[PDB]
Ligand binder design. Structure first.
Ligand SMILES: CCCCCCCCCCCCCC(=O)O
Ligand SMILES: CCCCCCCCCCCCCC(=O)O
Lengths: 157, 157
């Protein structure tokens, strides 16, 4: 009834600063990655760590039948690869793996939704392959993979 | 720029008669398996071949913000594992593989959506494994896998 996955030790949050694109997503419940109504079908556009180690997130979200940019803050906690968001719901963010150059893997809160981010709007097989491997104990009932044209669009088409 | 997949030769359509559940789905475009607005996010409930070899399909579909049962007819063609549907759009149906007992794999029409059907609302690893294998040249940007509770519900939750 249990399941485990590698995570980040030695995460220098300051190094994740910049522009990013959500290249893949997966969740354990199909509804979470719902195009209209699911608050985890979000497209990360920029990450902004603060001097003390909080994290400003710029993301897009379908809302009022349109793609919309939210500015969101995520507070640090005692674990540097885990953060928190008290918006409509209470949301924990967990970074699993990153080389800071190419890919960043993270998950969000019994139903998890995970993303593979990249710094350029191209597919990268390494990133995906590490996404697939990092997830493969988690049973993911939905998986989404975007193409390079979608990476540069309003909520990925 | 090209891609190919095994299909059915020797398909006795009469043997696919009965109750079925859509256990998995995949498509090459993410939007096709859209919960609200995508006419391929359909849940097959019963197949009814006619004496001559047409195919009556009972499926569910989200519509007017609610799960709804459609009765749909699919005409045979010169290829017995390929059928046609002229509804709102023009839709070709292609059966890839079936043992008639356990699993039935089919695809529907540059964007394809494919399903793995089963006769009982349980997961079957064989069926999924043959689904995964039958698809794995097709590049599928979305993949959905349902659990046994969803198999017996209104549009799978
Ligand atoms: C390390 C990258 C982390 C990016 C996390 C952003 C995901 C949070 C978006 C959803 C939170 C708000 C949900 C809500 O209150 O409606
Ligand atoms: C062998 C099993 C085949 C089941 C095929 C049923 C899928 C067709 C449903 C979508 C067709 C209607 C689309 C539309 O006109 O809006």
């Amino acid at each position: 009834m249990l399941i485990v996955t590698q995570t980040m030790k030695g995460l220098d949050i300051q190094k994740v600063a910049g522009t990013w694109y959500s290249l893949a997503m997966a969740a354990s419940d199909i509804s979470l990655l719902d195009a209209q109504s699911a608050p985890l079908r979000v497209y990360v556009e920029e990450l902004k760590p603060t001097p003390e180690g909080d994290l400003e997130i710029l993301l897009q979200k379908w809302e009022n039948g349109e793609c919309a940019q939210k500015k969101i803050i995520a507070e640090k906690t005692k674990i540097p690869a885990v953060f928190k968001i008290d918006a409509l719901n209470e949301n924990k963010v967990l970074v699993l793996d990153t080389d800071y150059k190419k890919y960043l893997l993270f998950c969000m809160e019994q139903s998890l939704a995970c993303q593979c981010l990249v710094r350029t709007p191209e597919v990268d097989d390494e990133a995906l392959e590490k996404f697939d491997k990092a997830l493969k104990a988690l049973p993911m009932h939905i998986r989404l993979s975007f193409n390079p044209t979608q990476l540069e669009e309003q909520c990925h088409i």
